[PDB]
Amino acid sequence: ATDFNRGIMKFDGADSPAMIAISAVLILGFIAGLIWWALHTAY
Amino acid sequence: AVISVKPILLAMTPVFILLCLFFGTRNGFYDTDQYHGNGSAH
Amino acid sequence: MEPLYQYAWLIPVLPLLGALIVGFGLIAFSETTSKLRRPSAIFIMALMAIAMGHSLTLFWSQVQGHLPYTQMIEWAAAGNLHIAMGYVIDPLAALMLVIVTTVAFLVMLYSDGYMAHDPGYVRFFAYLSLFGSSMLGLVVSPNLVQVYIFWELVGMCSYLLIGFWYDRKSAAEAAQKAFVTNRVGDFGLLLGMVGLFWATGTFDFAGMGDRLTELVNTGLLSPSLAAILAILVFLGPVAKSAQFPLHVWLPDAMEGPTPISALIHAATMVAAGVFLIARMFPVFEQLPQVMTTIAWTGAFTAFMGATIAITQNDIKKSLAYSTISQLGYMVMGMGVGAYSAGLFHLMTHAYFKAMLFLGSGSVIHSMEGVVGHNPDLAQDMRYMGGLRKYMPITGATFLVGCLAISGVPPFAGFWSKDEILGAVFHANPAMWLLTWLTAGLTAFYMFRMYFMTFEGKFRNVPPERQEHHDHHSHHAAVPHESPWTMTLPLVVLAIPSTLIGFVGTPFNNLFEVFIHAPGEEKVAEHAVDLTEFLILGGSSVGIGLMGITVAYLMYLKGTPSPQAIAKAIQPLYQFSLHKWYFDELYEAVFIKGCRRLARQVLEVDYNVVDGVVNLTGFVTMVTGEGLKYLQNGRAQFYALIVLLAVLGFVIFSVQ
Amino acid sequence: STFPWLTTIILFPIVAALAIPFIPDPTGKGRPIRWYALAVGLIDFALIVYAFTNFYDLNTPGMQLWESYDWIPEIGLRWSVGADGLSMPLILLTGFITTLAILAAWPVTLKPRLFYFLMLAMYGGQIAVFAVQDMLVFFLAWELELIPVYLLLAIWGGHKRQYAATKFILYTAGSSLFILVAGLAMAFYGDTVSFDMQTLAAKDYALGFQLLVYAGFLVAYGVKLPIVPLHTWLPDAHGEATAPVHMLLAGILLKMGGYALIRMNVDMLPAAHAKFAPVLVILGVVNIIYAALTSYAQRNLKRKIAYSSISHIGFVLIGIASFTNLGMSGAVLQMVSHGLIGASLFFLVGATYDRTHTLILEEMGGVGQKMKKIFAMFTACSLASLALPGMSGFVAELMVFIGFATSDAYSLPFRVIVVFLAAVGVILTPIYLLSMLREIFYGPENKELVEHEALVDAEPREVFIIACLLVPIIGIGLYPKLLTQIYDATTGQVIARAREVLPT
């Protein structure tokens, strides 16, 4: 992740492992929340 | 009333073929400086 | 008529082919074509002047009484889903055909003077012809698909032209913002283009009004649901014409070349952002809640862009914030309904902004003589005052362009501008008295920009005293730097100004509106009185005329100060000096926010879904090093497992 | 007509790939083996255009080169080939991009006897996937590009080649087994043991069986066409690679995972489609928004466009699972147009990196001052991938938005949100493409220019391969019935296969 914080507009500072899990549950929850939408909203 | 793709492809094939066999002969920089050398992404 | 009108698609494809060739001549033959700067400029200009020869006869044939002529060619077909792409020659379309090729031939006459010291002289005429062919297809367009093929093309030509120099870091970031901010409107246009093909079923403007009005009263569509459709189409022209949410790219579009600013305020802005809503009036007049949205976001921008033009030190950044407001002054004319007057203030805007922009470039190429190439703001180093005291013909023509935008007695605007002030005090006078207050403020910054830099003394002594350039000593002070290639275009762009000194007059306003009928023959107007028009026009030429007397007295005292305004209204002056504090809302929230959302989609990629794949390869390698310890030598232990499995399979298989 | 045409095109490179160790004169680097491999590419592309302009006989649904040769009667398999409308655009594309991938493989002097062997063997192992009408030959041809593309990434690759090469052969051969499993599940259903792709379609299946075969096919086709949970093999295998290899991965090899979705998940299993089709368009929407924000946040240059290729793929899912003749005609046109666009991007990343030796995108700036023809070419190819009109990126996505929200299948609160969500990719693709252009070319701040980056040029051969690929990008984008007439009548039966089932 040190090569992911390359010296351009990145390194927001939230590359901590406490943030990685709480960013995952919203992102992987939105795809799962959209798939479970689809089988009941489309037909 | 559609332009067919067969007369526009058969007339574009033998210009594409004769231009690669010419443009292969013309190149620069890939034989003189070329510090990549052998290993093509090292 | 038949070789004039069946070959009418040649007006887009002629100046495209002038850039197709030099684009093929610069990418393959750049050793000769970079040297062939002078012939390839005249070669590219020849296909534009022939395209001027089509339109000047395609429009003059239209006002004699010829019918509109349509053509449609199938573009992408499927089962029961056709896309048609052709053209129309419409008196609205043929009027815009003249404007976008007259000012394009003009700016290519201009371009031989502002450069030919620049090595990018050959490429600049390749991009300038790439603008026009992308632009001349937008005006002849019959469909909502066909206006969208050339919507995102002219933003591509606007991206390439702002980043023309591309060695400035400032012109780098300016080019990208002009593509992204227009793409939000293109995100809006694409939603309504599919959204209106969903509801109506056909992509043409004429077939969209009759089909939308068929479902809104029958009961298939809702009055609230179909209102958000035509709002989304309108979100397109708020980007290109720089309305309220999307206007941040115009101070930075002045980081490009000065010829381009004349063309991106006469072709992509006053044309593109207004031609679409003028063509979509079959949809908008059946929706009352949409037209009140258009006029409110137009009238706010007439106020919003006007005050940032005040205390603006840069000349091109003051003209850029002018045409934010003047386009905003015009889109609300399409929003209150009175749109034929909104279309005849379009022609005098495009021919005078280019008069004001190319006139401003005569100042910058003059001021490069005494000052180095870094500052282009109001004058320091022999400060502001005098340029017309040197008596140039370049300086008297950006006054005449400045004069006919406020509402002065003897010139234009008295015929076209104040017509939508009387039609806007009919319905909602609360949100539309705001245009009257800034009507004296549009008169302010225009004449604030005139006699600050054209009346006084501006050649004597250096305050900063650092030019040190042979390219500045050869920049020809005493404004004759403006060569022979500004004597024609600064004059010949004023020869349509006396034509609209004759047309669009109180007898030819009636005859030109008679050309500009809407989608139907009916014309909706509240009331027009004989006596009441005289004071509504007579008190309104005052607020223009006495609006500059407070500017004739403010910026002719040397300091910008009547009493207690040197210590200014800093609640409000910090807004206009720091440019509305609107660039920083879009930057600290959207630019940082998408630099914060995107980063943690990358780290959930590299660590969660890459963590599972790198765990299947880890629990199989440590399974291998767990049964590698099953064998340990000691061959008697191997004889146990042979004997234990004999005991196992005879308890396994008897039940 | 009697002459086996598709059997020639499949086997003529692999027969002539074996004659590479017998080519004489290894006097230094490999010059004569570079010219033999190029010329044997071109005379097979001439064999595709001879077989197409004389024998294809378009606006007819079905295969027109039908050659069912007997191979092994015990297993029941034959050597059957055939070109329909869902494949004959892609046989033509494969013979076009590979012949440029030989020509873009010119500076290689590492192992040139081995490079052009596998690339000619991969040129046969790609046409063989689109052409065969069988199931044990289709599983053969799917994994026939398994060992040459392990070796193309491992020997000529960046750093972390070996971590990228063995993550890829284990993830694709670890997913190709569902082709054999689901290909055997339909073969033994009923009473016949037929393996042809026609009788397996013309067989009637049960509904509960069809959802097991479709979910077996979905993982086997969600890996190659990177449906975004199953995608992690790609940006390593595409991130650490050379430009002549990369044109065969992103240009063509992703298209086989989308070609096979149209053939074997829409034709053969229609009532399996109509049950789990709205999961595809939601996996198509997230394919665009995830892969455009993942592309923006990355600073490795070859890895930015590698994640971008997942995003352009995201309209193939919306195009397939929309049950409209313009949606499916916009997905096939998306696969052709991304191959021509993605090859023209992925060549110039190698063309940039061969001069500046970095890919890091922070030590760059002012590259457009030294090389201009590289800058003028990398602008026209990145503008092609913006879905900008006048090029084939926009017309391929124009039919998908129109084709999806004109279908009488979904409900209206679903179709509004998907069109609103897929069009966020319209905003998102200029964010990272133009910021890639800006942080490399635009600017005064150059490199150290002493230790690294000693050279800059633009070879007059390299200007051809972009101008060779930008001709059919624009030529399709200005008249898309140059391509839509090839597959009008065969796509019109796949949609006729899924319309009669649709209320289910």
State the DSSP H helix or E strand holding residue D34, giving kind and residue range, or none if neither: helix D32-55
B-contacting chains (≥3 CB pairs under 8 Å):
D
Q: Which residues have a Cβ under 8 Å from the Cβ of D461 and sit 6 or more positions away?
A: B23, B24, B26, B27, D103, D106
Cα separations (Å) of C136 from C89, C128, D127, D434, D503?
Answer: 12, 12, 44, 26, 47
Interface residue D353 vs chain B (CB under 8 A):
yes
Method for this entry? cryo-EM
Residue whose C-alpha is closest to residue C351's, from C413, C442, C266: C266
Interface-testing mutation among D108, D152, D161, D461, with chain B (most B C-beta atoms within 10 A): D461
State the DSSP H helix or E strand holding residue C77, giving kind and residue range, or none if neither: strand C74-77
Residue whose C-alpha is closest to residue C235's, from C248, C221, C245: C245
List the alpha helices (DSSP H) in C64-168: 91-114, 121-139, 146-149, 151-162
Nearest to C601 among A14, A19, A27 (CB): A27
Q: DSSP class of residue C66?
A: P
- Chain A, residues 1-20, CB within 8 A of chain C, namely 1, 4, 9-10, 12, 14-15, 19-20
d(CA C355, CA C430): 34
List the alpha helices (DSSP H) in D18-111: 32-55, 88-103
d(CA D27, CA D33): 11
d(CA D354, CA B36): 7
Inter-chain touch C604–A20, beta carbons under 8 Å: yes
C483's tokens: 């060569």
Cα separations (Å) of D162 from A14, C173, C347, D165, D231?
Answer: 30, 38, 65, 5, 18
Q: Which residues have a Cβ under 8 Å from the Cβ of D418 and sit 6 or more positions away?
A: D281, D282, D285, D318, D404, D405
Identify the residue whose tokens are 């605007």: C413
In b/e form, how buried is each residue of C57-79, taking b as 16+ CB within 10 angstroms? ebbebbeeebeebebeeebbbbe
Angle, vertex CA C296, rays to CA C292 and CA C299, nearest 5: 140
d(CA C585, CA C591): 9
Nearest to C173 among D232, D368, D438 (CB): D438
CA dihedral sign, ordered C148, D487, D469, D349: positive
d(CA D127, CA D159): 30
Q: In terms of residues, how long is chain B?
A: 42
Nearest to B5 among D109, D461, D485 (CB): D485
Interface residue A25 vs chain C (CB under 8 A):
no
Q: DSSP class of residue C89?
A: E
> Are the C-beta atoms of D71 and D477 separated by less than 8 Å?
no
Q: Which residues have a Cβ under 8 Å from the Cβ of C542 and sit 6 or more positions away?
A: none
- Quote the minimal CA–CA distance from B12 to chain D in Å: 10
Nearest CA in chain A to C606: A1
Interface residue D459 vs chain B (CB under 8 A):
yes
d(CA A32, CA D43): 50
> Are the C-beta atoms of D69 and D133 separated by less than 8 Å?
no
Inter-chain touch A31–D286, beta carbons under 8 Å: yes
> Are the C-beta atoms of D296 and D435 separated by less than 8 Å?
yes
d(CA D113, CA D107): 13
Phi then psi for D61, rounded to 5 degrees?
Answer: -80, 130
What amino acid is encoded at C595 in this protein? Answer: R
In DSSP terms, D79 is beta-bridged to: D69
Strand, coil or helix: D70: strand
Residue whose C-alpha is closest to residue C327's, from C244, C403, C260: C244
Q: Which residues have a Cβ under 8 Å from the Cβ of D62 and sit 6 or more positions away?
A: D84, D490
CA dihedral sign, ordered C30, C31, C34, C37: negative
Nearest CA in chain A to C599: A10
Break-preceding residues in chain D (C–N over 2.5 Å): none
In DSSP terms, C74 is beta-bridged to: C84
Interface residue C380 vs chain D (CB under 8 A):
no
In DSSP terms, C76 is beta-bridged to: C83
Inter-chain touch D278–A6, beta carbons under 8 Å: no
C67's tokens: 């019918």
Residue whose C-alpha is closest to residue D321's, from D258, D370, D368: D258
Identify the residue whose tokens are 């494949």: D87
D27's tokens: 């006097």
C528's tokens: 């027009």
Alpha carbon of residue D461 to chain centroid: 24
Identify the residue whose tokens are 């933003």: C155
Phi then psi for A2, rounded to 5 degrees?
Answer: -70, -30
d(CA D78, CA D135): 9
d(CA D504, CA D501): 7
The bridge status of strand C69-71 relative to strand C87-89 is antiparallel
Residue whose C-alpha is closest to residue C56's, from C3, C14, C98, C87: C98
- Quote the minimal CA–CA distance from C234 to chain A in Å: 29
Cα separations (Å) of D504 from B41, C206, D275, D405?
Answer: 52, 39, 7, 19
D234's tokens: 């790609």
Alpha carbon of residue C10 to chain centroid: 25
> Are the C-beta atoms of D486 and D335 separated by less than 8 Å?
no
Identify the residue whose tokens are 């404007």: C99
d(CA C509, CA C512): 5
D-contacting chains (≥3 CB pairs under 8 Å):
A, B, C
Taking the CA atoms of residue C169, residue D437, residue C151 and residue C322 in that order, the dihedral angle to the nearest 10 degrees is: -10
Residues in D closer than 8 angstroms to A4, CB to CB, are 297-299
Residue whose C-alpha is closest to residue D453's, from D360, D384, D356: D356
State the DSSP H helix or E strand holding residue C31, giving kind and residue range, or none if neither: helix C30-33
Nearest to A10 among D282, D297, D411 (CB): D297
Residues in D closer than 8 angstroms to C184, CB to CB, are 427
Identify the residue whose tokens are 């499916």: D328
Nearest CA in chain A to C591: A9
Residues in C closer than 8 angstroms to A12, CB to CB, are 595-596, 599
Residue C635 half-sphere exposure toward CB, CA atoms < 13 A: 0
Are chains A and C in touch, 3+ Cβ pairs below 8 Å?
yes
Inter-chain touch D103–B30, beta carbons under 8 Å: no
Are chains C and D in touch, 3+ Cβ pairs below 8 Å?
yes
Strand, coil or helix: C70: strand
Rounded to a whole number of angstroms, the CA Rg of chain B reads 18
Q: DSSP class of residue D71?
A: E
Inter-chain touch D439–A3, beta carbons under 8 Å: no
Residue whose C-alpha is closest to residue D258's, from D232, D223, D233, D304: D223
Residue D494 half-sphere exposure toward CB, CA atoms < 13 A: 33
Contacts across the A-C interface (CB distance below 8 Å): 32
Inter-chain touch D464–B42, beta carbons under 8 Å: no
Inter-chain touch C604–A9, beta carbons under 8 Å: no
Nearest to D232 among C152, C159, C613 (CB): C613
- Quote the minimal CA–CA distance from B15 to chain D in Å: 11
> Are the C-beta atoms of C241 and C331 separated by less than 8 Å?
yes
Residue C413, Ramachandran bin (φ over 0: left; ψ between -120 and 50: alpha; else beta): left
Q: Which long-range contacts (CB under 8 A, 24 or more apart) does C615-618 make?
A: C617/D167, C617/D170
Residue whose C-alpha is closest to residue D432's, from C161, C179, C421: C179
Residues in D closer than 8 angstroms to C143, CB to CB, are none
- Quote the minimal CA–CA distance from D6 to chain B in Å: 18
d(CA C606, CA C611): 7
Nearest CA in chain B to D89: B5
C-contacting chains (≥3 CB pairs under 8 Å):
A, D
Residue whose C-alpha is closest to residue C580's, from C248, C352, C345, C337: C248
Nearest CA in chain D to B8: D482
In b/e form, how buried is each residue of A3-35, taking b as 16+ CB within 10 angstroms? ebebeeebebeebeeeebeebbeebeeebeebe
d(CA D502, CA D266): 12
Phi then psi for C544, rounded to 5 degrees?
Answer: -75, -45
Q: In terms of residues, how long is chain C?
A: 655
The bridge status of strand C82-84 relative to strand C74-77 is antiparallel
Taking the CA atoms of residue C605, residue C611, residue C614 and residue C616 in that order, the dihedral angle to the nearest 10 degrees is: -120
> Are the C-beta atoms of C609 and D235 separated by less than 8 Å?
no
Residue D232 half-sphere exposure toward CB, CA atoms < 13 A: 21
Identify the residue whose tokens are 């005329």: C545
> Are the C-beta atoms of C315 and C449 separated by less than 8 Å?
yes
Identify the residue whose tokens are 């990196």: D353
Residues in A closer than 8 angstroms to C600, CB to CB, are 14, 19-20, 23, 27
Phi then psi for C70, rounded to 5 degrees?
Answer: -110, 155
- What residue spans define the domains of chain C? 1-577, 578-655
| CB atoms near residue C1 (< 10 Å) | 9
Q: Which residues have a Cβ under 8 Å from the Cβ of D143 and sit 6 or more positions away?
A: D172, D173, D176
Contacts across the C-D interface (CB distance below 8 Å): 147
Alpha carbon of residue C450 to chain centroid: 24
Residues in C closer than 8 angstroms to A20, CB to CB, are 600, 603-604, 607-608
Contacts across the B-D interface (CB distance below 8 Å): 93
State the DSSP H helix or E strand holding residue D290, giving kind and residue range, or none if neither: helix D278-296
Residue whose C-alpha is closest to residue D470's, from C163, C148, C23, C47: C23
Are chains D and A in touch, 3+ Cβ pairs below 8 Å?
yes
d(CA D276, CA A43): 11
Residue whose C-alpha is closest to residue C102's, from C146, C63, C51, C149: C51
Inter-chain touch A8–D360, beta carbons under 8 Å: no
Number of H helices, E strands in chain B: 2, 0
Strand, coil or helix: D185: helix
A-contacting chains (≥3 CB pairs under 8 Å):
C, D
- Quote the minimal CA–CA distance from B25 to chain D in Å: 8
In b/e form, how buried is each residue of D45-81, taking b as 16+ CB within 10 angstroms? bbbbbebbbeebebeeeebbbebeeeeeeeebbbbbb
CA dihedral sign, ordered C458, C463, C464, C466: positive
Angle, vertex CA C240, rays to CA C236 and CA C241, nearest 5: 105
| CB atoms near residue D197 (< 10 Å) | 24
Cα separations (Å) of C608 from A20, A43, D310?
Answer: 8, 32, 18
Residues in C closer than 8 angstroms to A28, CB to CB, are 604, 608
d(CA D179, CA D174): 11
E-only strand ranges, C400-558: none
In DSSP terms, D67 is beta-bridged to: D81
Cα separations (Å) of D197 from A35, B8, C512?
Answer: 31, 32, 68
Alpha carbon of residue C36 to chain centroid: 32
Resolution reading in Å: 3.5
